[PDB]
From a paper:
In addition to DIX, Dishevelled has a PDZ domain (Post-synaptic density protein-95, Disc large tumor suppressor, Zonula occludens-1) and a DEP domain (Dishevelled, Egl-10, and Pleckstrin), separated by long flexible linkers peppered with phosphorylation sites, and also a binding motif for the AP2 clathrin adaptor (Yu et al., 2010). Here, we use structural analysis, as well as biophysical and cell-based assays, to show that the DEP domain of Dishevelled undergoes a conformational switch, from monomeric to swapped dimer, to trigger DIX-dependent polymerization and signaling to β-catenin. This occurs in two steps: binding of monomeric DEP to Frizzled followed by DEP domain swapping triggered by its high local concentration upon Wnt-induced recruitment into clathrin-coated pits.
Thus, two DEP cores are connected by an extended β sheet, composed of two antiparallel β strands (each made up by a β1β2 tandem) that interact with each other through backbone atoms of residues 442–447. Indeed, dimerization does not involve any loss of intramolecular interactions, since β1 and β2 do not interact detectably in the monomer (Wong et al., 2000). In each crystal, two DEP dimers associate with each other through this hydrophobic patch, thus linking four DEP cores into a cross-shaped tetramer. The first condition is met by the clathrin-coated pits in which multiple Dishevelled molecules are juxtaposed, potentially reaching a very high local concentration which could be sufficient to induce DEP dimerization. Thus, they mimic the conditions during DEP crystallization, which inexorably induced domain swapping.
Numbering used by the authors:
A (entry chain B), B (entry chain A), C (entry chain A), D (entry chain B): 415 to 509
Write the structure that this text describes.
């Protein structure tokens, strides 16, 4: 019992920050952003496979989604060249 | 049915964009960022409750954590005011 | 001087990471996200002041904007409470 | 003068949201994230060009930085394969 409510706050925080303190530490985090009308890449692939005739298997639906990205019909919410099923997308200008 | 691999891409996309198309759309996104030594507010509360003497129940370790936030000993990864156990934090300057 | 294209990469990097190396390091990052139809709080205030009759000075159009935020007519792109003219917003549901 | 402080708030907001309302609208936004010890790709290239002997011009310094990324000695804060001078980075595990 070396720390208590009477120890100065700064010292308790440097204790918590030390290697092997026991504090569960992360090198990743997730942030929520409010964006109207965003969608997952996997959901797009699902929609195509179920509603567009002529895909022999789900693989070809992924290739078609990647085509939509290339053409600017859908857009990455943060700019990467590669289509990925875990990233989020929005529609392009469809006017 | 109405759409195939022969339909033009722009029209397939405008069908996917229409109301009631069945595409899962949401007003939010989740973004993964690499940030070394970040931690959940709930993991700060748990650490305090188990390593610092004099909290009669867990509620009191949450109030202490808020106090660390106010003092700048820990910092929100996106400037907010209220301490929340579901958000991610980093250490402030301790030197 | 001490480092060249013949030095091992890991050692060059540890030198760059040392205190007083001269590398510009900061406690913040800026991230660019594609989000259709977003807008600055200052541009909402300006719009209101110029298009809506009965604001004796600009301060009163800022208070009206806060009122839109409270009602959910506009939304913060990252859930905060306070209206700020330097942040970005989107439209809520209006139907 | 068709809108005023006496018009219902919802209607003023749908006015502001209409095409050609005059409201300045964005398809991009910038978010600030607090991350200890982050740095710009361009700053890294500068540091190398000025402190590591054997670069005939700044171009070769960019190629070397891209090598550090590939080797995991520096890391992207959001995961892309390409090194870019406008993105932000953090150090890898240098233990």
């Amino acid at each position: 019992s070396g720390l208590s409510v009477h120890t100065d706050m700064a010292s308790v925080t440097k204790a918590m920050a030390a290697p092997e303190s026991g504090l569960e530490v992360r090198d990743r985090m997730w942030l929520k952003i409010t964006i109207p009308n965003a969608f997952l890449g996997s959901d797009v692939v699902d929609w195509l496979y179920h509603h567009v005739e002529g895909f022999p298997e789900r693989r070809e639906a992924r290739k078609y989604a990647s085509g939509l990205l290339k053409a600017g019909l859908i857009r990455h919410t943060v700019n990467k060249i590669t289509f990925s099923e875990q990233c989020y997308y929005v529609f392009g200008d469809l006017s």
